[PDB]
């Protein structure tokens, strides 16, 4: 007789998917949900490299960062994982890790002199250089601050004020010296105890030196606790001190804000990034989720340890 | 039903008729159709309402008591684990649901043809039905669109059916 049969479709696609029970099921059709393409390491916007210097080295003015000098705008700054130049005179940076988040949001700054090094009064600005922060063979100090010491055996109470007439946020940095012994304090500041009073429209702190002889790092037994703040447009901040003071000399006017984050790798500067730029690279392929790197930039597919995420769309391909 | 049809490229589910006029494939498009809308909606909900990958956490002060970020570090790592599991599992779940769904649609199309034909045809080992009567292209299309007329052919099918057994 005549025959009418019911049947399904078979193709040639062998892309296989895995199910909650059976696996490697050859389906007629399937989507790859996991973005696992060739990382593949002008164009759009161009990035910058912190070279042998760290973010601290890139902002503190570590003498050897004189190479870094010249990078005002960028798309994605590049830091080495263990740079040679961090904090040559041993110490810490208060809130460095939210300032790096701030710079995850900064694409261009303008560095300018907020306080002249010689305009701090009858105080020695031409001194205050260390071998830990030596520039070349010659010794030196951080370029964005000045290490003021006594003039003619007296270090008076100095006071200056900066008014952000720029109309934009200004990143300002300074620090307090924590000498190793009392004699270092007396030799540099010609008194036994000192203070640093920082007061802005909103900021308010009084710091005092903590004198103790920490183990030697780069040959120094003393420390320095550096601090940073954002002077908002219209704010007039005032610095007052009679010792143990790393004067601000240069500040950064945030010129442009956006979403340029940072990483710690050593690949060549890579521009023309896609929606998601990763350390390995930036692939245009837009599968819902990716798995190249956990540390990503821009709107990014979620990192997942998976190696295959193929969603079954067609039916079980079984030809003949 | 053992195997699929590379020749039926009209949809996932359908028919292969073979009569006096000849033999041909032709997909059942209402069912194919409902399956496509269903799997499309499933995929859309999976992709769109997937999860909030963006770390909306403000992290105003992050952690930082320990040298490296301590709490948000392991929080993010644990969230990574949470979906790394959920997504693998959801893929599996929905893929076997899709295969069981395709299987159910096939089963249902077959049962519809069976309920139409009843006595006027014989069931065959695999997916196929052999008529006890001559089913031209009009009769074939009547079966497909669901308008098969049993009393029309019931007498012819009766005579043939009772003849094959001597």
């Amino acid at each position: 007789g005549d025959t009418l049969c019911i049947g399904y479709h078979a193709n040639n696609s062998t892309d296989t998917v895995d199910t909650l029970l059976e696996k490697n099921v050859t389906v007629t059709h399937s989507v790859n949900l996991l973005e696992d393409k060739h990382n593949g390491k002008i164009n759009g916007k161009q990035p910058i490299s912190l070279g042998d210097c760290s973010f601290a080295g890139w902002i503190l003015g570590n003498p050897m960062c004189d190479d870094l000098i010249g990078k005002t705008s960028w798309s994605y700054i590049v830091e080495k994982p263990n740079p040679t130049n961090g904090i040559c005179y041993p110490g810490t940076l208060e809130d460095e890790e939210e300032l790096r988040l701030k710079f995850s949001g900064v694409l261009e700054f303008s560095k300018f002199e907020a306080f002249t090094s010689n305009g701090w009064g009858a105080v020695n600005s031409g001194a205050g250089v260390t071998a830990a922060c030596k520039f070349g063979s010659s010794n030196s100090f951080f370029r964005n601050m000045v290490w003021l010491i006594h003039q003619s055996g007296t270090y008076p109470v100095i006071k200056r004020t900066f008014n952000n007439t720029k109309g934009r946020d200004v990143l300002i940095v300074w620090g307090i010296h924590h000498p190793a012994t009392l004699k270092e304090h007396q030799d540099l500041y010609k008194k036994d105890s000192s203070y640093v009073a920082v007061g802005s429209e909103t900021y308010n702190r009084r710091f005092t030196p903590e004198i103790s002889t920490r183990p030697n790092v780069n040959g120094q037994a003393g420390r320095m606790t550096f601090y940073w703040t954002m002077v908002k447009p219209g704010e007039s901040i005032t610095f007052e001190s009679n010792g143990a003071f790393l004067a601000p000399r240069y500040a950064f006017e945030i010129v442009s804000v956006g979403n340029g984050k940072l990483f710690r790798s050593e690949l060549s500067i890579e521009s023309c990034n896609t929606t998601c730029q990763t350390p390995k690279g930036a692939i245009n392929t837009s599968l819902p989720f990716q798995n190249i790197h956990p540390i990503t930039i821009g709107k990014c597919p979620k990192y997942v340890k998976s190696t295959k995420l193929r969603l079954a769309t067609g039916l079980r391909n079984v030809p003949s | 039903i053992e195997g699929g049809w590379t020749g039926m490229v009209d949809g996932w589910y359908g028919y292969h008729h073979q009569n006096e006029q000849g033999s041909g494939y032709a997909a059942d498009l209402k069912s194919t159709q409902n399956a496509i809308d269903g799997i499309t909606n499933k995929v859309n909900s999976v992709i769109e309402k997937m999860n909030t990958q963006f770390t909306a956490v403000g992290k105003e002060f992050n952690h930082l008591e320990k040298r490296i970020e301590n709490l948000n570090k392991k929080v993010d790592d644990g969230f990574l684990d949470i979906w790394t599991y959920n997504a693998e599992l959801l893929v599996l779940l929905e893929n076997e649901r899709t295969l069981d769904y395709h299987d159910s649609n096939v089963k249902n199309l077959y049962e519809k043809v069976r309920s139409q034909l009843k006595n006027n045809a014989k069931e065959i080992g695999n997916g196929c039905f052999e008529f006890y009567h001559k089913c031209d292209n009009t009769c074939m299309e009547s079966v497909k669109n669901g308008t098969y007329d049993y009393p029309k052919y019931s007498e012819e099918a009766k005579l043939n059916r009772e003849e094959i057994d001597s």
Partner: antibody, heavy 121, light 113 residues
Framework: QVQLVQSGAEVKKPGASVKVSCKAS????????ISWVRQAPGQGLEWMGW????????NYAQKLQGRVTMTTDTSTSTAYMELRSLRSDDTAVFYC???????????????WGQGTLVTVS | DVVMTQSPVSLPVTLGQPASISCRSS???????????LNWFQQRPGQSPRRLIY???TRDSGVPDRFSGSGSGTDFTLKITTVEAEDVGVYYC?????????FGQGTKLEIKR
């Protein structure tokens, strides 16, 4: 190459059947499909309907269901739209376009038609 | 059913000033093939329409590099650098993967704002 020739302009009264034709040349008829869209004066409407040369099959727009009948002549590679029960609101400029014939493939509107004015009053 | 909302119905664009057109969908427009489906197309007054973008990121062979199609998920855009003269016209969203597929409303361009 790109040759999608619609029918001539047509003028009728409400309640009469209308028939539009779209010719096509080249190797572009590989039993591929053809869809038709509506464009009301000044503002376009959504798709009207589609048909597959490979597998006789038609998808019609909603609330037109009952008036729209579409055909294909594979021998002349020609598609046909036929709207019954004409309305004054139906007065509009129609259009043809390419489409892929089996559902295993999706859709592609690579060509377009010369346009056919249809007036109903 | 699908709803294609186009927020920028009217667009006065100074020649040479890249502008964008936004299509927003009610549901997601991905498909079994894995390819999101919206194919932008343009129409000139008294001239039959012609498409420009294939899926979300393919340019029609006959499309200048100015016409760039973007978008992901449910919200999608179309930006044209240095908008030229013939670029003026009416634009439309495209088929949602759901058979009731919706062109949406229209968006018009101007020579120089």
């Amino acid at each position: 190459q790109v040759q999608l020739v619609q029918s001539g302009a047509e003028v009728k009264k409400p309640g009469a059947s209308v028939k539009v034709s779209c010719k096509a040349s080249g190797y572009s008829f590989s039993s591929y499909g053809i869809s038709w869209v509506r464009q009301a004066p000044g503002q376009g409407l959504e798709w009207m309907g589609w048909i597959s040369a490979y597998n006789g099959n038609t998808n019609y727009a909603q609330k037109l269901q009952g008036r729209v009948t579409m055909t294909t002549d594979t021998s002349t590679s020609t598609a046909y739209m036929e709207l019954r029960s004409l309305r004054s609101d139906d007065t509009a400029v129609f259009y043809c376009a390419r489409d892929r014939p089996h559902i295993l493939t999706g859709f592609d509107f690579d060509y377009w038609g010369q346009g056919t004015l249809v007036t109903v009053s | 059913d699908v709803v294609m909302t186009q927020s920028p119905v009217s667009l006065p664009v100074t020649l040479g000033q890249p502008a964008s057109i936004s299509c927003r969908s009610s549901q997601g427009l991905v498909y079994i093939d894995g390819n999101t489906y919206l194919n932008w197309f343009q129409q000139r007054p008294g001239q039959s329409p012609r498409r420009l973008i294939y899926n979300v990121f393919t340019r029609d062979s006959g499309v200048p590099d100015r016409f760039s199609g973007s978008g992901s998920g449910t919200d999608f855009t179309l930006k044209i650098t240095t908008v030229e003269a013939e670029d003026v016209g009416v634009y439309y969203c495209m088929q949602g993967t759901h058979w009731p597929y919706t062109f949406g409303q229209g968006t018009k361009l101007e020579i120089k704002r």
